[PDB]
Design a protein around this ligand. Structure first.
Ligand SMILES: Nc1ncnc2c1ncn2[C@@H]1OC[C@H](OP(=O)(O)OP(=O)(O)OP(=O)(O)O)[C@H]1O
Ligand SMILES: [Mg+2]
Length: 757
DNA sequence: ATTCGCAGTTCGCG
DNA sequence: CGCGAACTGCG
């Protein structure tokens, strides 16, 4: 099982390093034979010798062209012969590719911007994480002595806990008597103790939670203080850090640093991403949280250190369980894209498509295009129209059915052969003309990209069928996450057409897939109203909510199933309309804001203020309560009593202050053109932190009139006595708007609700 | 740093 | 105050 790939330089030569474990043994393979290259299209084959003389220099040493080869490639399905220019070192290309393209005898060059490590996997035909090997893995987490100081790693690490299959152990240098706690002399003795354990446990996957930005960054800066060689890797190297765009990540060579934080962010969407809520949302079991202020206060006095070692023991055991459930999900995802697990688990969806097509373009012998310069990327500022959101029928309806298309946008690409190489190809015999935009796509041959999208949806349906055949609630819950990732990955190919930095950028292909679907969802809605006589309530892009105004649930289900028989046969190719779910009652506020319930006791909310992160907890709590009462048995008279019991309770001072709103800071400190209630909290207290993009600023609005921007004052600087809370504003700006937008369909102009006296 | 459609707060500002 | 620009997060 190829774990990862790498390359180093020995005396000006490249040495590919293949990290793999096979038959239960770790092994490194070195390949000094592989050679970098990039293709060049020439006007004539007589001017190749005058091109074989181009010379540059990287660091004061001459750059030449090693070997030259003549191959036949296919540019967007068009045959072409380009010259393959081999070089001695991968870094020779960026020093000479710009001098070669400026040559008057060349037309253009391709495949000059690609990592030499990923090039070895694209060529040769190697897929990481491919095999039946059982990977030995352990998770670890650390506890720090954190005062409210300034420097990052000024406080020492107190206890490094780790957990594998044998259990969770803690290593501290303080007097703690527990079965799983290892006591050492000083902080230096436990860091070298952790190295002794990592080398002894022999793991291939190092699991951490936010270890990219904290743990490895903390242990490193702490070893700078103690002068310790943090040789974690199989190669014997210290954990290397690579900056990804803005943030950074840490890799351990010879192993796989599995940071669960970037993976779980995309896998499941939750209000908070603390390890307590993640373990609760995945395993249904509560986990306690002790804070650094509680840890520091407990370590200074030397008392209550049993909980700190108990909490740290939980962090290692919880991280290992999570890292064990999500590893097969990222292992297969690494097999699809064909790159290292460390890259795939933390890279964007746009790069996963980039790595996948480059591997396929080498199989199809397709010469991949290039990324745009400033000129071409400026042309791609064009926008297109896509998505038909129907104005919903405001009010409460019953016995509603949600019939949504199954992978609408990818199926349109597969069925209509939507591809840049099929777009307006003059000469073919069969065309598929797109609505409104008028683009036509050749169908004589399977175009590049639709042929790849077919097998991706087959890998998702296999996971969908495993869910039905699985009785384990947690094991089937992970499969729901896997089939959901393939859905997001498939639609990324459609958005990849609209991506300005995409190699296979085709706005026409993107605008056509949006032209379709808009035609399909409007066609499908009219077939339900004119025939069968459904009352379509609201549609977004893939489906709609339809019902019969008076028929019971039995008639609506049967008639909807017959409608599925009378649409799928009419829809061509991969286009299919499926029965996703029936619902007892459902409220539709406005566009993309609605609530719905199953026949079984549960509530599903989409777009409403409950899911919004930047709202007061009382606004989400009350809105969920008035929704829970409405969908259970109507009883709006009882729901109105709920909207008044909190406003009257808001007259007196609130419960221990919820009413915390959360808005992170985008842009950069002062790059704003307008300051709201937050940002003003960032403008103040800035002389503070770096105020880097992505910092949540939670404030509390108090005092009285005017601002807003001048009435907050966050949460860390709050006092219920000297700083009189408002107990208002939230009755007009938080709670009441998120509620009136619901009850207004019943005839309440907010004249009711309050007042006293 | 896949695409676009979407409701909404906030408020400087003639 | 009504309207628009900026800003936030969700689908
Ligand atoms: N991030 C996205 N960007 C653009 N279009 C998207 C995105 N996610 C989805 N879409 C597209 O817009 C809607 C549609 O995603 P559905 O919620 O309707 O779910 P499925 O149909 O894919 O999969 P199912 O049958 O429910 O199992 C998808 O085509
Ligand atoms: Mg969805």
């Amino acid at each position: 099982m190829i774990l990862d790939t790498d390359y180093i330089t020995e005396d000006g030569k490249p040495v590919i390093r293949i990290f793999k474990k096979e038959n239960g043994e770790f092994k490194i393979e070195y390949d000094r034979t592989f050679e970098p290259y990039f293709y060049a299209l020439l006007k004539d084959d007589s001017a190749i010798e005058e091109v074989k003389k181009i010379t540059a220099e990287r660091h004061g040493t001459v750059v030449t062209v090693k070997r030259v080869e003549k191959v036949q490639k296919k540019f967007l399905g068009r045959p072409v012969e380009v010259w393959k220019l081999y070089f001695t070192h991968p870094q020779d290309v960026p020093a000479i590719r710009d001098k070669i393209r400026e040559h008057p005898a060349v037309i253009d060059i391709y495949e000059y911007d690609i990592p030499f490590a990923k090039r070895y996997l694209i060529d040769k035909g190697l897929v990481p994480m491919e095999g039946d090997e059982e990977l030995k893995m352990l998770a670890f987490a650390i506890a720090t002595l954190y005062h409210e100081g300034e420097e990052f790693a000024e406080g020492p690490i107190l206890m490094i806990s780790y957990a594998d299959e044998e259990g969770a152990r803690v290593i501290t240098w303080k007097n703690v008597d527990l079965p799983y706690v290892d006591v050492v002399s000083t902080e230096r003795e436990m860091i070298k103790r952790f190295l002794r354990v990592v080398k002894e446990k022999d793991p291939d996957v190092l699991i951490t939670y936010n270890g990219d930005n904290f743990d490895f960054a903390y242990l490193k800066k702490r070893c700078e203080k103690l002068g310790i060689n943090f040789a974690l890797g199989r190669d014997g190297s210290e954990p290397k850090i690579q900056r990804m765009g803005d943030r950074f990540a840490v890799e351990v060579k010879g192993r796989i640093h599995f940071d669960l934080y970037p993976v779980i962010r995309r896998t499941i969407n939750l209000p908070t991403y603390t390890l307590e809520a993640v373990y609760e949302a995945v395993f249904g079991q509560p986990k306690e949280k002790v804070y650094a202020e509680e840890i520091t206060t407990a370590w200074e006095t030397g008392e209550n250190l049993e909980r700190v070692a108990r909490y740290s023991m939980e962090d290692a055991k919880v991280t290992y369980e999570l890292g064990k459930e999500f590893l097969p999900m990222e292992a297969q995802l690494s097999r699809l894209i064909g790159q290292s697990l460390w890259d795939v688990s933390r890279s964007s969806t746009g790069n996963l498509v980039e790595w996948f097509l480059l591997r396929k373009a080498y199989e199809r012998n397709e010469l991949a295009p290039n990324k745009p310069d400033e000129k071409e990327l400026a042309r791609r500022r064009q926008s297109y129209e896509g998505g038909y959101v129907k104005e919903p029928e405001r009010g409460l309806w019953e016995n509603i059915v949600y019939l949504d298309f199954r992978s609408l946008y990818p199926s349109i690409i597969i069925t209509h052969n939507v591809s840049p190489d099929t777009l307006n190809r003059e000469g073919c015999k069969e065309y598929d003309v797109a609505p409104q935009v008028g683009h036509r796509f050749c169908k004589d041959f399977p175009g590049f990209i639709p042929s790849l999208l077919g097998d991706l949806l087959e890998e998702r349906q296999k996971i969908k069928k495993k869910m039905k055949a699985t009785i384990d609630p947690i094991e089937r819950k992970l499969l729901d996450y896997r089939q959901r990732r393939i859905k997001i990955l498939a639609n990324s190919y459609y958005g990849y057409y609209g991506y300005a930095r995409a190699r296979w950028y085709c706005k026409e292909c993107a605008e056509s897939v949006t032209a379709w679907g808009r035609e399909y969802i409007t066609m499908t809605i009219k077939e339900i109203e004119e025939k069968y006589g459904f009352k379509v309530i609201y549609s977004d892009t893939d489906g709609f909510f339809a019902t019969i105004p008076g028929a019971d649930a039995e008639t609506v289900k049967k008639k909807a199933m017959e409608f599925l028989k009378y649409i799928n046969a009419k829809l061509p190719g991969a286009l299919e309309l499926e029965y996703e779910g029936f619902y007892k009652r459902g409220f539709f506020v406005t566009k993309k804001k609605y609530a719905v319930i199953d026949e079984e006791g549960k509530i599903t909310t989409r777009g409403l203020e409950i899911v919004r992160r930047d709202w007061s907890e009382i606004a989400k709590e009350t809105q969920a309560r008035v929704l829970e009462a409405l969908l259970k048995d109507g009883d709006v008279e009882k729901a109105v009593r709920i909207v008044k019991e909190v406003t009257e309770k808001l007259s007196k001072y609130e419960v221990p202050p919820k009413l915390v709103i959360h808005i992170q800071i985008t842009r950069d400190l002062k790059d704003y053109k307008a300051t709201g209630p937050h940002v003003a909290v960032a403008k103040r207290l800035a002389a503070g932190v770096k105020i880097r993009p992505g910092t949540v600023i939670s404030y509390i609005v108090l005092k009285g009139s005017g601002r807003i921007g001048d009435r907050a004052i966050p949460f860390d600087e709050f006092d219920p006595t000297k700083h009189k809370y408002d107990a208002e504003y939230y009755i007009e700006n938080q709670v009441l708007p998120a509620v009136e937008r619901i009850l207004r369909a019943f005839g309440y102009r907010k004249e009711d609700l309050r007042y006293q006296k």
